[PDB]
Write a protein that binds this ligand. Sequence first.
Ligand SMILES: N=C(N)NS(=O)(=O)c1ccc(N/C=C2\C(=O)Nc3ccccc32)cc1
Length: 281
Amino acid sequence: MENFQKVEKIGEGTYGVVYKARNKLTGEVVALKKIRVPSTAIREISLLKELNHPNIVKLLDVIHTENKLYLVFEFLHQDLKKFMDASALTGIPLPLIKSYLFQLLQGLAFCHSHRVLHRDLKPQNLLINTEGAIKLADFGLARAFVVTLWYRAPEILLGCKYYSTAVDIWSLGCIFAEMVTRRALFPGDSEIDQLFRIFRTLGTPDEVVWPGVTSMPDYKPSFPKWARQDFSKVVPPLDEDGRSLLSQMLHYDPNKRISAKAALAHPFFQDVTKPVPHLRL
Ligand SMILES: N=C(N)NS(=O)(=O)c1ccc(N/C=C2\C(=O)Nc3ccccc32)cc1
């Protein structure tokens, strides 16, 4: 903490405050994260350091000093939330949405193959650079260690404590929809509002569509029954390839919901390219 000249506070996270900081000895600009320490956690984090991929924001150093923890990460200039806001009036071009989504699925497919889950994907954890790359931040901190419930998967909301990599697919599906319509898909303001927002669009799940759902911890027989809506009405004007992919990412049953690896082979990515965005830094 003495070797860093904190420039600005980049924002608070689920596990701590992040600062844009400049390393004194090296001059390099990094993202320093002060974790808000157990032995398990240290080991957890230390595995994440060796998890390298072009679509994962790199964990550079871990500093446990004076019984405090700080994580040093590579720095990217803008998050997807700010870029979306900037493009609110015109929307993000489909060719760019398609490239960002393809890159994110590659990152997830890498993490998921190493049994690492993000568990808290949101536009704010997605970082972009001038070269057209997009990277995931916070990967693996959930395991080792007002909040937005907008991108939370149904199984978490219903009390499943042993969730899987499918939760990340769901969150990504929610971000995919938001980039296309320029409006949050399920903006719930509490857990039950969140749940009901999902039920009102996708229909209240039952044993036909989701076997075992009625035996979930927080499922109540008293849940109102809503019918399912046409996706054509939910995500206009996404073409049929996009909508079919989206429906596979938003399946209720985690076991049925598409994997990141299978998603990469979907017809929607037949014409992917890597356009370079216009970023105002
Ligand atoms: N607020 C500013 N300055 N611009 S911005 O809002 O687009 C913005 C700019 C940079 C970042 N970067 C965040 C991060 C970064 O670079 N690496 C990380 C690793 C872990 C957690 C967060 C980060 C996040 C937001």
